[PDB]
Amino acid sequence: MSLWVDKYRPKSLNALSHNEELTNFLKSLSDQPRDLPHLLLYGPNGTGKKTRCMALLESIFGPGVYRLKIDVRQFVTASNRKLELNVVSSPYHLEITPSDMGNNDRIVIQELLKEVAQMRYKCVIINEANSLTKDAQAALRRTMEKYSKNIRLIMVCDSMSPIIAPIKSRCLLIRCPAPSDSEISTILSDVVTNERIQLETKDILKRIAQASNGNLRVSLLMLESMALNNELALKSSSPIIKPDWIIVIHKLTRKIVKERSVNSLIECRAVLYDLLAHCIPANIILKELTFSLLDVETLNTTNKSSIIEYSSVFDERLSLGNKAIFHLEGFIAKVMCCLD
Amino acid sequence: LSLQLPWVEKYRPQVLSDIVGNKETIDRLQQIAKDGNMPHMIISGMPGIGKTTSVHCLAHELLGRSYADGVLELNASDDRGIDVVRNQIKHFAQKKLHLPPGKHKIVILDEADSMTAGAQQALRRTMELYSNSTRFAFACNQSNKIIEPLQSRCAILRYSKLSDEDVLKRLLQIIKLEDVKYTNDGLEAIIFTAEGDMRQAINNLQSTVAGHGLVNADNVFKIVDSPHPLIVKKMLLASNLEDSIQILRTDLWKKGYSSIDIVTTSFRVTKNLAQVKESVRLEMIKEIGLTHMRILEGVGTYLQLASMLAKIHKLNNKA
Amino acid sequence: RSKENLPWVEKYRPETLDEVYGQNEVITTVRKFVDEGKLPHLLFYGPPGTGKTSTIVALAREIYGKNYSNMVLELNASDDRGIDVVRNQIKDFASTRQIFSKGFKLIILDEADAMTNAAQNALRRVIERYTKNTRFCVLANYAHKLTPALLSRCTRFRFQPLPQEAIERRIANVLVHEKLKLSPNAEKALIELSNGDMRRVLNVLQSCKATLDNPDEDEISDDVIYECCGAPRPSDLKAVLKSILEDDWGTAHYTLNKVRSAKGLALIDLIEGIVKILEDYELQNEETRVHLLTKLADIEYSISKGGNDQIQGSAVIGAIKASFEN
Amino acid sequence: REEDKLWTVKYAPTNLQQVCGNKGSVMKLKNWLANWENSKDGSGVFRAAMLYGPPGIGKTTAAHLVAQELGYDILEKHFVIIMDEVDGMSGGDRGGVGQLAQFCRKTSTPLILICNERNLPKMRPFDRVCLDIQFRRPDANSIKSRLMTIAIREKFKLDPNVIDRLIQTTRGDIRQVINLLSTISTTTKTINHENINEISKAWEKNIALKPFDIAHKMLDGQIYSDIGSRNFTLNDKIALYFDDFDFTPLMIQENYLSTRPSVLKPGQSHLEAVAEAANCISLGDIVEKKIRSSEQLWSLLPLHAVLSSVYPASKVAGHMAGRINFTAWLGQNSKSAK
Amino acid sequence: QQPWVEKYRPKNLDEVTAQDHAVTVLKKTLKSANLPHMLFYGPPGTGKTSTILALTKELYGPDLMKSRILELNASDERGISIVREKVKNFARLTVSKPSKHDLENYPCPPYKIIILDEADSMTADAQSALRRTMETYSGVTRFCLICNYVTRIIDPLASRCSKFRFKALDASNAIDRLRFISEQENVKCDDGVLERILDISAGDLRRGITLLQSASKGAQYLGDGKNITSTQVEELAGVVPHDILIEIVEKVKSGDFDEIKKYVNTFMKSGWSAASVVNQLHEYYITNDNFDTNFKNQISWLLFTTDSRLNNGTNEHIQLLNLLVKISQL
DNA sequence: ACGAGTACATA
DNA sequence: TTTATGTACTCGT
């Protein structure tokens, strides 16, 4: 489409100018397709783990992988609740996303597995697999073990810590490291040479590369934003722009550091309500909020240590819970107590 | 084989005089049986205090002449529903049996606290329609779940926990009826193991009589030991940590009690505790609940109880 | 087939009331119950695998004749205890009485602490309605999962956990029946790891009998018990405790790794062993006990979650060292 | 039928002027019946008014009396249907509420509805189409005079001043007052101030609190003080939670930090007191997820009261600076659902 | 041509050269028929499923196990109603008549075995069903409970079955099996490669099988004909190199909170799992004798807090940053 | 009588 | 909104 994220996606392993070691690893695993075990790709977001999986299916299956359709199936759960989740369909492979609700997500995966496992192997890809609430993983650790000839499981996730030990035990650990500033600068240069961008100085490319912090999708989206706003002219004085989420987190951090009162608590609670209404997971909000708090030069080592300790405590508290408001409110109260 | 009747029915009262407990309620029941214009009542309380036997005795004193057809004994054991109950009530109310002018029919709904809402909504309509012809009665467990307008339309008669005197005199009546040797120490052991309930006291008495015949504290504790709330009370208020650990082990861990039962009892005791501060009580409750979570997840271990009382003593000595 | 084709737990089920040992206080009470003809509603309580259902089956066989199979109805959790099922089965069974040659009827409720509160409200009224010729026996392991009225109406019976006397009597009986020989250290270890359950003892002794290449003319010692049950040796526990308490970090870590790798020892079992041998040693101060208890609870919680074993092993080492650093 | 009818039946108000309390409501009902056939204040045409309020106060009795004085045919040339217990549906009729709404809209007779205090969420069919004649807790003058008349006719005496205590104990339930007087007079005809305490402690009429009302009671600095500890024990606080346990933990979190901490420890500040209570809600977050997970551990429900409703409201408590704050987490899901 | 995770599955009881305490009992009960209910618990990858599959294959041959063995796992429904409607029906019916060919080639017991794999993630109502399901019809069927966490199973069900613990596959117990697999697959290796592979895996022979398969695939793809080196298996396992660990340690020892923060950001952008980092930090600090005892204890507790917080979800970056900051302030 | 859609309670 | 098991209901075939 018109989005820049689909036009520059690699078409085969020849276009994987990201990591020579990872490309050689994929070629080695594609050398013997029959002996391919279950695979687990891990790395920071934007590294292209989905791209590596898709290219691996290209190397294994061959043609017909890029041509796929979308299907919708009905599911039944406890009581009379009915849930709908979209699955993409291809003639050879299949993959299903856990984007549905995380409680009854196990039974949908089970019924898909025993519906497509009635009878060379059919690879299945589970992106963002860390969202499984220890039940879908408990189903997979048996489904892939008992069926190790008809369907091969491909695990796509990051931060394996919520993932249980047996799932990682019956999976292959393959790295997808984030590239340095050089590789992302070169890929941005390739993009702007593919287009017609009036780049004045190469320093702005380095700055827009460093703004992503090891994340290709946000870098490419913000490059498209710069091209649209500045009329395809990447001048040295190009105004840097950031998504409004980081802007409002910076504003909330400034509000906390400038004053420690109760009205500020009400305002930041309202901001938290708005952010959770913006349909965003709370773990990344806590992570980037703690990043913003630690960026202030006024903070001292004892206050920063207390901040990170409370951040870790409320991180495990949020992980062992569902009401994201309580943990964020408690962490903000703790950091305001520490600052005051 | 040839079993004699249990002591429960061997001592089930037939007159209001034999019923033990509070005096005001029983004299009110006797006077309203003498008058005959018995109003609608709701009876609730802890089990084994005379909630349905008093109702049965009152029904006897009211109509002992037409018991088989003028008192509909609607039991909780029988089928219960919004419609199957009201159909039977209507069939029992539409009949034109010529009752005495000073006597009214009694409808008994034993343990009716667990009915649905619509059953109560139909019951209030039937009750207000046929109040002059028939009268209702209830012997429910807890009146909190009973909806308020039914309580308003009826006369609320709530009993209390039986004291030592009435249970003691009932036990002496049982002893003189059975001619069984007894001891005052055995009597006090029985009434302490009765936890207020007198039916449990009768059960322990018959067990003691059958097993040994002599009422002594040792055998009574051998069948029915000390109640868990008070032993957990002593375990939770002990100042010394290792003394508390030894007490809990000897009293609940070597006695076969399940660990989760111990945690639930500790939570209930801390809920009902009044000898310490309220905030300390809340902190004790929350740490006991953390231990409860750690056991309900699957980790049922004596070490969980040990850590629970370690945190208890950490709160006690202000860390 | 019958015998010699059953697990030792079920092969040696007590058919009569004389085969139950360790519960003599309740055994004589129920024997006087059946002899004197005064049997109220029962309520048996105790640890798992502590002779409840075997005792009630033996009592039913002693009381009734050969017709106990087709006349006595026993409902379990697998047989369901729904309120509708109870109302249309148990009430009908208790209401119907055979005209001749009957004293009473017996209904046994096993694992009754698994049904809803409305079910218990139904069962209590079935108990108090047809008790003239029907008795109810209730088996449960959690008294807090049942309504207080059900506990009050039935006669509470608590089974004290089986001591070493009953366990050693059962061991002697099974070795006499199966022609087996045992060593004093083996039976001492069996007492130590019995945990008050006869089923585990029978399973472990069966594993020991199957362990020997030639069961006849062979003796089972403590090492066989430890290797079959997967339990750590007390000498190993003492050595690990001494190494952690006295030796420095590197030597203690190496010794603990060697101890675990010698026979594939488990970290968790070593944890319960060390924590049950701490209290045998007198401690001077008091907050060290609190630290020990909370830290052992935390490491057991982590093990129940999982993780890499060496991390929690070093955690146990640090827990002990920091607790005894005072 | 000598000595057969109940006291609430033999002493029912024969005339409409014999009723006690809600005199303005009685006047409004009389005006609505009078202005029915003429279709000022707009209530004449905005018909199908109900009589809602405390149970057992004479709403059905008042409707019957105003119907019989106007010549309407009593049913439960002018005819009326006095249909009682609107809440008898109990969330039922599965759309029959709409049928009742259209029946209220179009009927040839003055349909009078009687219901108790309204907690059901089925207010939508009757939100703004019917006149809301509100009945409240009655006074203690006309009811007092009726009690004197009943006691005089029944040959027993009672102290005029304790009638306030009897009315407050039952919370304005005239029928319950009559029943209680009959019950006590069956044994103790004389009523004095010595037995008022035991009568009240035996005849307390506990009732639930709309999720907004429980927050005000929970967020009070008196109950957590030394004096209020005995008045409102720890058992009562958890028992209060179970009345609206679905909405109690959400209501406490939205307003616990919006009130001044009247129970501050010396050396404790406002921000630190909230922080010591803000984290405790996250401890109750673990319990709420674990209670209603696939394990279904419902035996842990009383614990969730302390961790999410009591302790957050115990560290900070006092007179709230404004009205009760409704929970906003429910509102945020509506925005996220779109 | 099949993956080594299941192609080399143990098809015989003697093929399982580990946990011989739980193997000799089965071997001796092949001849007899007094097989009690067993509970297979332990670390994952120890071969409990393989052991029970070998026992099932050896007991009932190739057909009586199809006709007798019933399997239920977490993939299928395991509610109380499902248990009542399925396991009760299976246990109530008598065993099938064995074929004439199975009375001479297989010593098949006249009962059946029902396995319950992954019983840890299963409710207590099914537990209430099975406590009497395994006692009412113990004479006609046998029951198996297999779970890596015996703690989830309550005391009753654990006591009813035989607690056959599975020994952890340490570095001194599983060398022979992996070595024999290595010469069976004809892969070159050094003297210490096998010990390093067994040390990296936390008692997971299946994980070691996967690493060996990956190393063999890489060696056959490159085709240079070189033996597998230690650095190769460190790179396959995701183990951080020692120089990066040393520079991380010296940066931590120097304070510099901002420097620690930016280097930790770079280290997590390198894409290395935090569990491996915790393991490497532990094995570096504990073996080193430079630090005094109190520092050793407190850093061990900080590593324990780090991983016992990690395994409950959370973010690896925050946990590792907090760990490094807090050990930098000791 | 039994199967399916329905809402409510779980101290 | 929550989450399986149980209970209850009632209209329909």
Ligand SMILES: Nc1ncnc2c1ncn2[C@@H]1O[C@H](COP(=O)(O)OP(=O)(O)OP(O)(O)=S)[C@@H](O)[C@H]1O
């Ligand atoms: N107040 C009492 N006086 C005499 N016997 C009593 C009394 N309360 C209970 N009993 C005896 O207890 C047995 C029956 O008790 P119930 O009346 O069923 O107990 P309850 O107090 O009514 O509580 P419920 O409604 O049954 S749970 C009979 O043996 C009675 O003799």
Ligand SMILES: Nc1ncnc2c1ncn2[C@@H]1O[C@H](COP(=O)(O)OP(=O)(O)OP(O)(O)=S)[C@@H](O)[C@H]1O
């Ligand atoms: N006192 C005892 N003496 C001898 N064997 C006993 C004794 N108590 C229990 N057992 C043994 O325990 C085995 C299994 O116990 P059961 O009686 O079937 O179950 P239980 O003890 O009632 O506990 P539950 O309810 O099944 S958890 C029996 O086969 C007996 O061999």
Ligand SMILES: Nc1ncnc2c1ncn2[C@@H]1O[C@H](COP(=O)(O)OP(=O)(O)OP(O)(O)=S)[C@@H](O)[C@H]1O
């Ligand atoms: N003001 C009053 N003075 C004297 N008696 C009264 C008064 N109000 C009510 N009563 C009595 O209390 C009874 C209550 O009857 P209803 O009017 O049906 O009660 P209600 O207010 O409609 O509440 P419900 O519908 O019964 S829950 C009347 O029948 C009278 O006997």
Ligand SMILES: Nc1ncnc2c1ncn2[C@@H]1O[C@H](COP(=O)(O)OP(=O)(O)OP(O)(O)=S)[C@@H](O)[C@H]1O
């Ligand atoms: N003792 C052993 N000897 C040889 N191979 C083994 C042994 N234990 C495990 N394996 C290998 O481990 C792989 C899988 O074994 P499994 O039986 O699935 O282990 P597991 O105990 O079932 O792990 P789970 O299911 O996650 S608890 C196979 O390739 C087996 O060959």
Ligand SMILES: Nc1ncnc2c1ncn2[C@@H]1O[C@H](COP(=O)(O)OP(=O)(O)O)[C@@H](O)[C@H]1O
């Ligand atoms: N080797 C590569 N060469 C060119 N583009 C790449 C490469 N790797 C990743 N990309 C870019 O990454 C984008 C897809 O990233 P994605 O797979 O969504 O990351 P993640 O899986 O972490 O979400 C594509 O638009 C593609 O242009």
Ligand SMILES: [Mg+2]
């Ligand atoms: Mg009763």
Ligand SMILES: [Mg+2]
């Ligand atoms: Mg049993």
Ligand SMILES: [Mg+2]
């Ligand atoms: Mg009415």
Ligand SMILES: [Mg+2]
């Ligand atoms: Mg397996």
